[PDB]
């Protein structure tokens, strides 16, 4: 429909669940997919096997716009952070850049206590 063809990627990676969203450079969302729609429904959502399928479903849903210009942003540690770009290359997207943009605070608020067990 739009076919500006410069949509960026936002691969949010967390220990519990991974989220990937496809939006343009300005930030207006285009299409997103998550492990929740996948159907593991539990701790298996964190597995890197679901992140790649979520990324590929997002890419197939986005190609209806005509996405081939990739700007990827990974935030937060945990498994499945690297599988998303792997699948997004497996489907065949051309790459503009890959870089790490996770925010680390400069002495932010007090963190929670340590879990003893």
């Amino acid at each position: 429909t739009r076919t500006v063809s410069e949509g960026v990627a936002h691969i949010h990676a967390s220990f519990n669940n991974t989220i990937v969203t496809i939006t343009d450079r300005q930030g207006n969302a285009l299409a997103w997919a998550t492990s929740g729609g996948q159907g593991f429904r539990g701790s298996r959502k964190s597995t890197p096997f679901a992140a790649q399928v979520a990324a590929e479903v997002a890419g197939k849903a986005a190609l209806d716009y005509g996405l081939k210009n990739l700007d990827v942003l990974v935030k937060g540690p945990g498994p499945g952070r690297e599988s998303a770009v792997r699948a997004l290359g497996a489907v065949g997207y051309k790459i503009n850049s890959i870089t790490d943009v996770t925010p680390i605070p400069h002495n932010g608020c007090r963190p929670p206590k340590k879990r003893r067990v």
């Binding site: 929670p112 340590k114 879990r115």
Partner: peptide
Amino acid sequence: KREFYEKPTQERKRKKAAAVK
């Protein structure tokens, strides 16, 4: 993210004592 208000001095002193040897 967690805090260790007492621990980092002990931790870094152990760090240096174990790195020197």
